[PDB]
Tab-separated table of C-alpha atoms and ligand atoms in Angstrom:
chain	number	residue	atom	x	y	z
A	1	UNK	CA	99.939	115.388	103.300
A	2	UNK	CA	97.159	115.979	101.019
A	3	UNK	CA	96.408	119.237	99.501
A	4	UNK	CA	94.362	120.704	96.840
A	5	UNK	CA	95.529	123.979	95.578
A	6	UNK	CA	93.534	126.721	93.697
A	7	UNK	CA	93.764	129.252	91.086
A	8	UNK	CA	95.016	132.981	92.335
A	9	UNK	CA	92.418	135.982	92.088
A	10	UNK	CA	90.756	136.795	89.424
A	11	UNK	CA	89.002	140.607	88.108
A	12	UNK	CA	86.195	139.841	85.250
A	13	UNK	CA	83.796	142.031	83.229
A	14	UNK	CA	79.819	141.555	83.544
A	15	UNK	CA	78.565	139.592	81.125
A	16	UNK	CA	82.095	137.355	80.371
A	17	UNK	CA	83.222	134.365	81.935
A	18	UNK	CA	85.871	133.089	84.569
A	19	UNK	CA	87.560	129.886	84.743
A	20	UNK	CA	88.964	128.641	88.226
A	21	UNK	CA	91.248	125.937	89.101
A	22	UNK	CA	91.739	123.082	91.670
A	23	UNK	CA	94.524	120.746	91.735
A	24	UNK	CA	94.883	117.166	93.668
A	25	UNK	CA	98.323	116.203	95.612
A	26	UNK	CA	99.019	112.932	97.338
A	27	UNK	CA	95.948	111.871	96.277
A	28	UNK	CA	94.278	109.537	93.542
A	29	UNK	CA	91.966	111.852	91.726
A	30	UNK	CA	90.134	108.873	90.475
A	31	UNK	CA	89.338	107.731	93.860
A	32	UNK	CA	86.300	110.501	94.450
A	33	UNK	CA	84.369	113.222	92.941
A	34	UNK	CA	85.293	116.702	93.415
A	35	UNK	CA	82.444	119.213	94.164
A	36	UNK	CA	82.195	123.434	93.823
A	37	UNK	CA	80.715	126.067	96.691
A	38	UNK	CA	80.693	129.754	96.901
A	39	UNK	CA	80.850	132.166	99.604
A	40	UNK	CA	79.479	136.145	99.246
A	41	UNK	CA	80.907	138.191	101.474
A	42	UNK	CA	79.215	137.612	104.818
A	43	UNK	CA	77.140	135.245	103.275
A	44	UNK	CA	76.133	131.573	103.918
A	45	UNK	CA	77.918	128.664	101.368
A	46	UNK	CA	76.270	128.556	98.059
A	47	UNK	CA	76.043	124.809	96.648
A	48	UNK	CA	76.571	125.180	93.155
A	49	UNK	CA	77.079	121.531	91.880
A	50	UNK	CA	79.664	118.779	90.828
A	51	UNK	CA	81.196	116.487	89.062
A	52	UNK	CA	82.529	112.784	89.760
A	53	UNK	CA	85.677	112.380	88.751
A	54	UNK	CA	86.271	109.388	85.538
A	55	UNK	CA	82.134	109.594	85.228
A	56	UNK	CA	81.537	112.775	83.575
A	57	UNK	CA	78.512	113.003	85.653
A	58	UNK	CA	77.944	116.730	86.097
A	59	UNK	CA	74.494	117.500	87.434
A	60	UNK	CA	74.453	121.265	88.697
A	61	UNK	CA	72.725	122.701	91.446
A	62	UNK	CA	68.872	124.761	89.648
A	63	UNK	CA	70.065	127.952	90.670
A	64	UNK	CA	73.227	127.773	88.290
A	65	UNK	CA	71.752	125.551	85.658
A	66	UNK	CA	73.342	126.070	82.335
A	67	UNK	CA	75.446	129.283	84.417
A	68	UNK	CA	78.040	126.995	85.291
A	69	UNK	CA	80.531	124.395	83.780
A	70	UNK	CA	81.934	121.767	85.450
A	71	UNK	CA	85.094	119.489	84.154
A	72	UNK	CA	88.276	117.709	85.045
A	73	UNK	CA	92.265	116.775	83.456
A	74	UNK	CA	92.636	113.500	84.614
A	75	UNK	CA	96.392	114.047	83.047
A	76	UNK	CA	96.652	116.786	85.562
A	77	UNK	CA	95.098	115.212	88.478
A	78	UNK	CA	92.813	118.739	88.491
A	79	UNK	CA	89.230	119.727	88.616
A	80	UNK	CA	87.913	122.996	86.542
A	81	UNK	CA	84.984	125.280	86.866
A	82	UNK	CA	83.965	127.991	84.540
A	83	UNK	CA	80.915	130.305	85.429
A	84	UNK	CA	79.148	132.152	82.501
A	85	UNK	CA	77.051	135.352	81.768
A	86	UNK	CA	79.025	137.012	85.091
A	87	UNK	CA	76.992	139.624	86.788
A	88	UNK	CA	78.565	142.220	89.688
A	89	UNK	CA	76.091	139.807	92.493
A	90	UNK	CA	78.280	137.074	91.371
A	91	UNK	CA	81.500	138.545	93.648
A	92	UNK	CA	82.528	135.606	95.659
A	93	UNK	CA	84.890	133.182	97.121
A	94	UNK	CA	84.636	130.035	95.457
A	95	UNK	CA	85.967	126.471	96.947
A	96	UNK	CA	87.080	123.442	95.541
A	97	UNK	CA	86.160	119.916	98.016
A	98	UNK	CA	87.090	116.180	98.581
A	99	UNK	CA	87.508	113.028	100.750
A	100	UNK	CA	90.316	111.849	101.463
A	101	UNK	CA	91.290	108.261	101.644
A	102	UNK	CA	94.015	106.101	99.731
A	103	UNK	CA	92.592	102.715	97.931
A	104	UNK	CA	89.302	102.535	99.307
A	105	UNK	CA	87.997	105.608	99.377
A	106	UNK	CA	86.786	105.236	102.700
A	107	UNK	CA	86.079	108.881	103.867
A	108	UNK	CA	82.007	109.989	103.498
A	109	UNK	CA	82.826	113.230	104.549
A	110	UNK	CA	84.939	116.183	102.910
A	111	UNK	CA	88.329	116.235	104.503
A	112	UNK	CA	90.100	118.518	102.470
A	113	UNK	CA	89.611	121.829	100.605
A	114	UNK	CA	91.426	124.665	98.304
A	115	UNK	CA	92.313	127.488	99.958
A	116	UNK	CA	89.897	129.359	97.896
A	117	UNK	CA	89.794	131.752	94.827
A	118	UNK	CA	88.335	135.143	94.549
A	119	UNK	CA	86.178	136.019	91.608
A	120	UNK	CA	85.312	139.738	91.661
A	121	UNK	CA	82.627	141.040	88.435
A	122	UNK	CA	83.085	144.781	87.949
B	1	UNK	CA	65.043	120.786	96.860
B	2	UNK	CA	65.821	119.767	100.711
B	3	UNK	CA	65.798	123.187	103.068
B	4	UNK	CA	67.445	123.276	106.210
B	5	UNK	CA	67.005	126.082	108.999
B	6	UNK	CA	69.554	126.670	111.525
B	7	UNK	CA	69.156	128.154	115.095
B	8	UNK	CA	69.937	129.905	116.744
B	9	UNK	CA	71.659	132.007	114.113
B	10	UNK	CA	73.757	133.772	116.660
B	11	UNK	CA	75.149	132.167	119.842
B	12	UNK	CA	77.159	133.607	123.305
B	13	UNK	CA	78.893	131.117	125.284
B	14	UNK	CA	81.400	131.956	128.134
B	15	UNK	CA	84.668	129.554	126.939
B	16	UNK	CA	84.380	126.594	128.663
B	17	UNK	CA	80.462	126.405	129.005
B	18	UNK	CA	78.548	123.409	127.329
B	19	UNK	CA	77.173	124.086	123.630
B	20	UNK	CA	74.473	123.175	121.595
B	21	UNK	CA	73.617	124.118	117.714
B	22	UNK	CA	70.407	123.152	116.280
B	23	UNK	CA	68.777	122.577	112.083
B	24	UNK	CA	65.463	120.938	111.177
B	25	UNK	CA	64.620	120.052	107.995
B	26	UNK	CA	61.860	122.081	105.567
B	27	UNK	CA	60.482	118.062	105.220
B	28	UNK	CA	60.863	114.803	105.612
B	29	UNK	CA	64.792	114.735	105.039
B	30	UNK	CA	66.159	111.276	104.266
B	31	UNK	CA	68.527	109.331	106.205
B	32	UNK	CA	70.996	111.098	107.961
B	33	UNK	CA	73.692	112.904	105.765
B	34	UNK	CA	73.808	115.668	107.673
B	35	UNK	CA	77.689	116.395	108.034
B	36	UNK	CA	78.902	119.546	110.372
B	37	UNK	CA	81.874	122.094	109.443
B	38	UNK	CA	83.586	124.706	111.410
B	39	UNK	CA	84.507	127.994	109.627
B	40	UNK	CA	86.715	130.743	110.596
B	41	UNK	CA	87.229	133.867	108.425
B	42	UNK	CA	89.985	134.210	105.864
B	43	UNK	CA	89.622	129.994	105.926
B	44	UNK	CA	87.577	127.264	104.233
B	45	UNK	CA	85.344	125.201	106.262
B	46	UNK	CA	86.178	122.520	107.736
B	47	UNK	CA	85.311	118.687	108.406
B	48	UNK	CA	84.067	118.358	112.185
B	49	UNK	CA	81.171	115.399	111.744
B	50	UNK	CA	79.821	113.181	109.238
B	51	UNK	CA	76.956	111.033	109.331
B	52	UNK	CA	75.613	113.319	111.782
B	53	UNK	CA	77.103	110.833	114.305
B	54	UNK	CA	81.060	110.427	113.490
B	55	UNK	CA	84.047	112.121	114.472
B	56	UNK	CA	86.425	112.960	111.220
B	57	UNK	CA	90.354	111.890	111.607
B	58	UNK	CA	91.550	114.180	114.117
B	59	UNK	CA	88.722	115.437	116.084
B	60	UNK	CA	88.851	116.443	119.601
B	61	UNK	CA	86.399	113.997	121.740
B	62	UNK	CA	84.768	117.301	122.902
B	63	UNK	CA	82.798	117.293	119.374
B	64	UNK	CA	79.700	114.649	118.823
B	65	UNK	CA	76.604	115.127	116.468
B	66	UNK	CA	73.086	113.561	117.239
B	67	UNK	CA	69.521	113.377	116.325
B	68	UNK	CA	67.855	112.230	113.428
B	69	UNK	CA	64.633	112.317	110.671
B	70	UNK	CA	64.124	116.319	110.829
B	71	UNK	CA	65.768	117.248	113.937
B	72	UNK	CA	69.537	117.303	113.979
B	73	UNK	CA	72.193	119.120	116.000
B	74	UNK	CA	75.668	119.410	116.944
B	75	UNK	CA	77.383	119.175	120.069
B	76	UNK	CA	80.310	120.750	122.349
B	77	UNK	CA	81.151	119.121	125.631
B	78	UNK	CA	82.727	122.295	126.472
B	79	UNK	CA	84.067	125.564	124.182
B	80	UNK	CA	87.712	126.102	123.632
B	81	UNK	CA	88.758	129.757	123.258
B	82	UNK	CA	89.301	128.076	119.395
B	83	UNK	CA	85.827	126.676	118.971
B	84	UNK	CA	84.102	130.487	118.488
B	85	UNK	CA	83.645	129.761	115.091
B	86	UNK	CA	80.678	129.859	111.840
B	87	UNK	CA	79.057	126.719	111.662
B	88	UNK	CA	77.574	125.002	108.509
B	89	UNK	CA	75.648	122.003	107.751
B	90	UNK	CA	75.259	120.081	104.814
B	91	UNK	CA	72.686	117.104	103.246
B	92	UNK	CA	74.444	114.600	101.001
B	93	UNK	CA	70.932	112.779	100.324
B	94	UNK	CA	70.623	111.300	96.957
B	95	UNK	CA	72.106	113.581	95.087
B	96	UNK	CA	70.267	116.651	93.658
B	97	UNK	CA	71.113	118.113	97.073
B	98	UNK	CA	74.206	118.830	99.353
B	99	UNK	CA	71.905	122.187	100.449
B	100	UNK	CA	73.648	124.007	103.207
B	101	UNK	CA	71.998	125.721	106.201
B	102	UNK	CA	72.128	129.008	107.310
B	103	UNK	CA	74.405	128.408	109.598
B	104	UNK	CA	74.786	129.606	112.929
B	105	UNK	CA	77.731	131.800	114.647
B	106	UNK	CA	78.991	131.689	118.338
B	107	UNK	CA	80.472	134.655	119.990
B	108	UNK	CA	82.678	134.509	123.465
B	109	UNK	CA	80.580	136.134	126.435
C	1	UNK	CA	85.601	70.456	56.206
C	2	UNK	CA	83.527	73.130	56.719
C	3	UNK	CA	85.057	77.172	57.217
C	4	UNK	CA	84.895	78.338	60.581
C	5	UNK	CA	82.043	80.968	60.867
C	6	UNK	CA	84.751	83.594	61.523
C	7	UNK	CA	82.192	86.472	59.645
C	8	UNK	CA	79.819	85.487	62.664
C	9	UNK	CA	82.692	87.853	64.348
C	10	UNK	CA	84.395	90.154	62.492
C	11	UNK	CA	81.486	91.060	60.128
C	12	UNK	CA	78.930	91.133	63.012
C	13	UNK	CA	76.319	94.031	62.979
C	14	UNK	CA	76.766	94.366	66.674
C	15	UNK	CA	79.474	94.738	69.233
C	16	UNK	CA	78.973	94.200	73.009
C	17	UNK	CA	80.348	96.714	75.829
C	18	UNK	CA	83.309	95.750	77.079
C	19	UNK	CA	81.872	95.485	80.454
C	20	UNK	CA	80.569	92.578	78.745
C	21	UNK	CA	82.115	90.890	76.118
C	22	UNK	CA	79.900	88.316	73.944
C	23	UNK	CA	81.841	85.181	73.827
C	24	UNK	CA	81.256	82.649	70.951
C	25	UNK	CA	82.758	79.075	70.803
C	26	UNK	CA	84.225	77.989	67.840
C	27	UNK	CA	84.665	74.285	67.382
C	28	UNK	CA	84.752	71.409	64.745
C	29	UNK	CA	85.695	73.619	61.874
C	30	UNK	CA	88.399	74.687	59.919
C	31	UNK	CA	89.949	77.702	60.364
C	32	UNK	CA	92.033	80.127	58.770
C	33	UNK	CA	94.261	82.562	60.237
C	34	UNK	CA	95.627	83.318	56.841
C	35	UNK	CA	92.722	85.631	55.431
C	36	UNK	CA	92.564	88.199	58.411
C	37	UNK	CA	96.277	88.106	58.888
C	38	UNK	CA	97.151	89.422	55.061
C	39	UNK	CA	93.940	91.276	54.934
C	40	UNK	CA	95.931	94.115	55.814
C	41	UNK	CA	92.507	95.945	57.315
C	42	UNK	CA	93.151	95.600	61.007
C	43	UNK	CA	95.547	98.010	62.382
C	44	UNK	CA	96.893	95.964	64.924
C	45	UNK	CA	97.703	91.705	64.602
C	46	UNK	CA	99.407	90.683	67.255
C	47	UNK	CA	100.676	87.258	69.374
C	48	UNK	CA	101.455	86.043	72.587
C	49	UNK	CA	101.212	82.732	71.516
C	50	UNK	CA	102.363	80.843	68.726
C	51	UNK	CA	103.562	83.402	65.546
C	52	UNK	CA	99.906	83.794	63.116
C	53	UNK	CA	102.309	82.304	60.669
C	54	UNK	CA	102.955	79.262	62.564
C	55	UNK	CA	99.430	79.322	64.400
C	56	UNK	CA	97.153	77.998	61.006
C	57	UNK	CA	99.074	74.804	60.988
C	58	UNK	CA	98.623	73.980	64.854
C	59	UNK	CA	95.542	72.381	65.705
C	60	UNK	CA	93.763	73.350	69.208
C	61	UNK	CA	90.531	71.611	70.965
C	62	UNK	CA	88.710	74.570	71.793
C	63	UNK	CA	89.024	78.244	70.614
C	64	UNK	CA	87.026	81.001	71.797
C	65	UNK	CA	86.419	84.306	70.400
C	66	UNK	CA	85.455	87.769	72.842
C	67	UNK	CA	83.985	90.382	71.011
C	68	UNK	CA	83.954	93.997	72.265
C	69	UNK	CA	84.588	97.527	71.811
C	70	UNK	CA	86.570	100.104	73.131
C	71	UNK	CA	89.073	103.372	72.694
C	72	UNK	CA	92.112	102.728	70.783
C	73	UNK	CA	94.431	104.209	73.231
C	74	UNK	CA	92.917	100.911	75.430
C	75	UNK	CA	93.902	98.540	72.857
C	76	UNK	CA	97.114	98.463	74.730
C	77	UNK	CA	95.689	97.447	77.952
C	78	UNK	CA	95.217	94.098	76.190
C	79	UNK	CA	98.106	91.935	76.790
C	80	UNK	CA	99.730	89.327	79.807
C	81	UNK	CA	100.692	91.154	82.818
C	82	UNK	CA	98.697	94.808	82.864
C	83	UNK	CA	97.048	97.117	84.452
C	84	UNK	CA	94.334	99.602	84.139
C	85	UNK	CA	91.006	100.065	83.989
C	86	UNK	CA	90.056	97.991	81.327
C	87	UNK	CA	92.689	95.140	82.059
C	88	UNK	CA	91.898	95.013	85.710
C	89	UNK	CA	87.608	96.058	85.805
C	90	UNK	CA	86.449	94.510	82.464
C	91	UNK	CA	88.961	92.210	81.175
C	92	UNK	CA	91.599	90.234	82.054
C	93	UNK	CA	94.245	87.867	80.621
C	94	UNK	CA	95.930	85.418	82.153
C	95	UNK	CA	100.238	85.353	82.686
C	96	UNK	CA	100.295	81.790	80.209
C	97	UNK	CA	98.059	82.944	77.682
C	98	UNK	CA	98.274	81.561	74.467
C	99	UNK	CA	96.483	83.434	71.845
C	100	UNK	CA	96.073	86.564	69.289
C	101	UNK	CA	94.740	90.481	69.798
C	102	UNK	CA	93.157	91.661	66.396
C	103	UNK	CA	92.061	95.321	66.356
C	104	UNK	CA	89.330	97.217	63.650
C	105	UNK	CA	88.873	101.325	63.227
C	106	UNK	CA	85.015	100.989	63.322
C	107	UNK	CA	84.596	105.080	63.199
C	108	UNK	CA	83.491	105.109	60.416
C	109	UNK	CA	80.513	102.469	61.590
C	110	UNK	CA	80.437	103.194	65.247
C	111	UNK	CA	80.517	106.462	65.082
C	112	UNK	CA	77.357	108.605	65.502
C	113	UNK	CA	76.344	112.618	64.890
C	114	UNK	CA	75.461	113.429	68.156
C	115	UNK	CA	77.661	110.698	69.661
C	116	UNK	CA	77.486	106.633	70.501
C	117	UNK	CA	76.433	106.051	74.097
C	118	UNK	CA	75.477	102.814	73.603
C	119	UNK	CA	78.688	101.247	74.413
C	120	UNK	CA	79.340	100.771	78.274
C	121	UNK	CA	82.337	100.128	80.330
C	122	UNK	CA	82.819	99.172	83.426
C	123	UNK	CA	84.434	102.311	86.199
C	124	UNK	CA	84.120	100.549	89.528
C	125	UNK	CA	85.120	97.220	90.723
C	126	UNK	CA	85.857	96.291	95.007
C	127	UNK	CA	88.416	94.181	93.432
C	128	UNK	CA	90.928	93.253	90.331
C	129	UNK	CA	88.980	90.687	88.347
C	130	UNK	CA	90.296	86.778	87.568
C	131	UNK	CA	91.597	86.011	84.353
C	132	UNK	CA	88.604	85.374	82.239
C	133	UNK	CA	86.290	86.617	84.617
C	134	UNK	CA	83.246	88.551	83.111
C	135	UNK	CA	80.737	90.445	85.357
C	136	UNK	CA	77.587	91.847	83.967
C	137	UNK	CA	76.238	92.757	87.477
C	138	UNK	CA	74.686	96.452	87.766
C	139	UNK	CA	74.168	96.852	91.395
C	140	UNK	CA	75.482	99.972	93.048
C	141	UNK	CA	79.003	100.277	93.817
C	142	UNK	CA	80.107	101.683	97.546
C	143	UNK	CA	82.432	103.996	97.985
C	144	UNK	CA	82.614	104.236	101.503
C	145	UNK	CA	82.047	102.908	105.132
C	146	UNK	CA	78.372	104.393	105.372
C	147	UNK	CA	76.249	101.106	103.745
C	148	UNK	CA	75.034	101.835	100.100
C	149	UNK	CA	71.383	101.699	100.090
C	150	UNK	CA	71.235	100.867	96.826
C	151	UNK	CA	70.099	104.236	95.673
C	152	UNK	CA	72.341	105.978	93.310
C	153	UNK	CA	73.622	109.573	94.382
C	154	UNK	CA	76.680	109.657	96.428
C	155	UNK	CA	79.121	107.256	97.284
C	156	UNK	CA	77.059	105.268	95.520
C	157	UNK	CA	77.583	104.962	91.837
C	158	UNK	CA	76.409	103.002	88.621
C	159	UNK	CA	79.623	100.443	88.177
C	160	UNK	CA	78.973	101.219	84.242
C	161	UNK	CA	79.818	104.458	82.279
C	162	UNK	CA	78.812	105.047	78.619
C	163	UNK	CA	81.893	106.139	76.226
C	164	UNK	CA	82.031	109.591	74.517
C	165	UNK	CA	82.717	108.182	71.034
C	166	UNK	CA	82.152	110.831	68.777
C	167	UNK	CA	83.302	110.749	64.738
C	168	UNK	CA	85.547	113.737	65.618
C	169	UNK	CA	87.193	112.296	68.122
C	170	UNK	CA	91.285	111.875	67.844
C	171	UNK	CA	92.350	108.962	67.088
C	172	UNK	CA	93.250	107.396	70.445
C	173	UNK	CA	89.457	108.184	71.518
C	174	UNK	CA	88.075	106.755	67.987
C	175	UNK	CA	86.042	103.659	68.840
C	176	UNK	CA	87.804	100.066	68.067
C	177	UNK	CA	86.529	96.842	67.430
C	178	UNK	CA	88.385	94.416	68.831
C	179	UNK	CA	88.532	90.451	68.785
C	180	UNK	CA	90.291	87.969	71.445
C	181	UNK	CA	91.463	85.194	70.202
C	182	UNK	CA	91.675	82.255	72.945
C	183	UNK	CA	93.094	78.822	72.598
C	184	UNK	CA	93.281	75.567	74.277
C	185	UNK	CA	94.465	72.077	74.694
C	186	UNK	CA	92.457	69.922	76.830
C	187	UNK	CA	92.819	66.524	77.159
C	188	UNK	CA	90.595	66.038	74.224
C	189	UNK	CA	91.183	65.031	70.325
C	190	UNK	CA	91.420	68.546	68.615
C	191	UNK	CA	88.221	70.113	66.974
C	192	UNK	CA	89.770	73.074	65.060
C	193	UNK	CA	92.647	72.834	62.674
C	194	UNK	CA	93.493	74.860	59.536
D	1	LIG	C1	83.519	90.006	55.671
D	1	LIG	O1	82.732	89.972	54.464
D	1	LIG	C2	83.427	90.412	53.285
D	1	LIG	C3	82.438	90.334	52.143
D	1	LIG	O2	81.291	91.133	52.387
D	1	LIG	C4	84.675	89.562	53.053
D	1	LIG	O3	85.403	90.081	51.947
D	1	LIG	C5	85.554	89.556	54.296
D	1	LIG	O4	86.655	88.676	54.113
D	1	LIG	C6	84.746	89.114	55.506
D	1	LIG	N1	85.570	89.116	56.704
D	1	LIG	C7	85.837	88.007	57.401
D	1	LIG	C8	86.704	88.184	58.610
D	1	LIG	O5	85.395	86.913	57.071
C-alpha cells in the first residue's frame, strides 16, 4: 500500500517561516516528482509549485516566487517545503502529491496524497 | 498563466440522477491535461480522471471525462449518495502550469 | 619506441560529462604503468585485471582510455557487477573485464565560485545500458503511458542533469577525475607493451 505521510500542525509568527514534511512508503521516490498545493479554509486549491525528484528542478508557481522553498532527502525517501515572510492570509492546509507506479512510472495522474498539514500564522 | 472557469459552481442533483460538470479554458489551452479530483471535507482530493479521458485504478465505470481544446467536462452516469462531493480540475500543460479551477460543488436535492 | 601520449589524458585541460565519456585509442606505443602507479597523486589505483605491478610487463593489442568526471562517492559505482545510476545510465563494465580504475581530486581545478554546471550526467534511461555502451542522445525521456511530445514539462524530462559541484562541497560530492583503463587481446600482433 502506498502512502505518503505529513508533518503534524504547526502555529507560526507573521513574518517567520514554517517548514512542512512529506514522506514516501512503498514507493521509489526516484521514480516521480513530488508537487505542493494549499487549501484556505473554504477556498479553492492553491498551486504553489514543485520539484522533480533526483533533478533539482524547482520552478515555483509567480504567486509564491522567491516565498517558497522547495527540496527533497533522497536518504529519507521525503520531500520538504518551507514557506517564508508568513503573513496571517497565509492560514492553510497544505498537501503533499504523487503518481504511483513501480518501475515504469506509468501513472500520468496523481494517485496518492498526504493527509495534509495545517499551517496557522498568528 | 492558463485560467480555467468552472460551472456551474454549485450543483443539486436528486441521488441517482445523471450529472454533468463543466470548465473552459481563459485561451487556447494545449492538449488535453485536464485531470478531475473528487474532494470531501476533512480529506485530500482525490484521483477520479486523467487525460481528461481515463479512468484511474479503481474507478467506478459510472465516472468518464470528455471534450477537448477549451471545452472540457466531467461525467456521472448516475450519483451515488457518495458522489456529493467538491470537484477540482487541474492543467498539467508544459509545465509553468498545473492551474486549478474553481471548482464546482454538488448538493443532494 | 616512442612514450605513450598518456599526458593527452591525465594532464588534459578538459574532461567530458560522464553522460559522455571521450574515448581515446592508444596504440603502437610504449607504455608505462609505473609513473602513475608510484605517483602517489591519485587517491584511488585499482585492478580487476592483471596486478599494475604485473600489468607493465604484459603486452595488449589495443588499449583504450575513457575520460570523465564525476562525484567521488560514484567512484565506487565503477567496478564488474554494479548498480546505480552511473553504472547502469552512463557507464557500464562488463562481468570479464580486464583493466584498471584511476581516480584524481580535481577540486581544486574543477571547482568554481558560484559552482561548475558544466558537467552533465545522465538521470533517465528506458533501459540498463550494454557494457561499453555510450549514448549521447538528448531527446526527451517519457515517463508515462500518455506519448511525450517532445516538449519538456511533465512526464517529460531532459535525460541529462548538470552536477552541483561546488569548492565547498564534502568530500564525497567534490568533483573527480577519473580514467578507465581498457585492455584487449585480439587476434592481432600486440601494439602496446611497456
Ligand atoms: C603531467 O605533467 C607533469 C609536468 O607538468 C608531469 O610531472 C606528470 O608526470 C604528467 N602526468 C602524466 C600522467 O603524464
Amino acid at each position: 500500500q502506498m502512502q505518503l505521510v505529513q508533518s503534524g500542525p504547526e502555529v507560526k509568527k507573521p513574518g517567520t517561516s514554517v517548514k512542512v514534511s512529506c514522506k514516501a512508503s512503498g514507493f521509489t521516490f526516484m521514480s516521480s516528482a513530488v508537487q505542493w498545493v494549499r487549501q484556505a479554509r473554504g477556498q479553492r486549491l492553491e498551486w504553489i509549485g514543485w520539484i522533480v525528484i533526483g533533478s533539482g528542478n524547482t520552478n515555483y508557481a509567480q504567486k509564491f516566487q522567491e516565498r517558497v522553498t522547495i527540496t527533497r532527502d533522497m536518504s529519507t525517501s521525503t520531500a520538504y517545503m518551507e514557506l517564508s515572510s508568513l503573513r496571517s492570509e497565509d492560514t492553510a492546509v497544505y498537501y503533499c502529491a504523487a503518481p504511483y507506479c513501480s518501475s515504469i512510472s506509468c501513472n500520468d495522474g496523481f494517485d496518492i496524497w498526504g493527509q495534509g498539514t495545517m499551517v496557522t500564522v498568528s | 498563466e492558463i485560467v480555467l472557469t468552472q460551472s456551474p459552481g454549485t450543483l443539486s442533483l436528486s441521488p441517482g440522477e445523471r450529472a454533468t460538470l463543466s470548465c473552459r479554458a481563459s485561451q487556447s489551452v494545449s492538449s488535453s491535461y485536464l485531470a478531475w479530483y473528487q474532494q470531501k471535507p476533512g480529506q485530500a482530493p482525490r484521483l477520479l480522471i486523467y487525460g481528461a479521458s481515463s479512468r484511474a485504478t479503481g474507478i467506478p465505470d459510472r465516472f468518464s471525462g470528455s471534450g477537448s481544446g477549451t471545452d472540457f467536462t466531467l461525467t456521472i452516469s448516475r450519483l451515488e449518495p457518495e458522489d456529493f462531493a467538491v470537484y477540482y480540475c487541474q492543467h498539467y500543460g508544459s509545465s509553468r502550469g498545473w492551474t486549478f479551477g474553481q471548482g464546482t460543488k454538488v448538493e443532494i436535492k | 619506441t616512442n612514450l605513450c601520449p598518456f599526458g593527452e589524458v591525465f594532464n588534459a585541460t578538459r574532461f567530458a560529462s560522464v553522460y559522455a565519456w571521450n574515448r581515446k585509442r592508444i596504440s603502437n606505443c610504449v607504455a608505462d604503468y609505473s609513473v602513475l602507479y608510484n605517483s602517489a597523486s591519485f587517491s584511488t589505483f585499482k585492478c580487476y585485471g592483471v596486478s599494475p605491478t604485473k600489468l607493465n610487463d604484459l603486452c595488449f593489442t589495443n588499449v583504450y582510455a575513457d575520460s570523465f568526471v564525476i562525484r567521488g562517492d560514484e567512484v565506487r559505482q565503477i567496478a564488474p557487477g554494479q548498480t546505480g545510476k552511473i553504472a547502469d545510465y552512463n557507464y557500464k563494465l562488463p562481468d570479464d573485464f580486464t583493466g584498471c580504475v584511476i581516480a584524481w581530486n580535481s577540486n581544486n581545478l574543477d571547482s568554481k565560485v558560484g559552482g561548475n554546471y558544466n558537467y552533465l550526467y545522465r538521470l533517465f534511461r528506458k533501459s540498463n545500458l550494454k557494457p561499453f555502451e555510450r549514448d549521447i542522445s538528448t531527446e526527451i525521456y517519457q515517463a508515462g503511458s500518455t506519448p511525450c511530445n517532445g516538449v519538456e514539462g511533465f512526464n517529460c524530462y531532459f535525460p541529462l542533469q548538470s552536477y552541483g559541484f561546488q569548492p565547498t562541497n564534502g568530500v564525497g560530492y567534490q568533483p573527480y577525475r577519473v580514467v578507465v583503463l581498457s585492455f584487449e587481446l585480439l587476434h592481432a600482433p600486440a601494439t602496446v607493451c611497456g
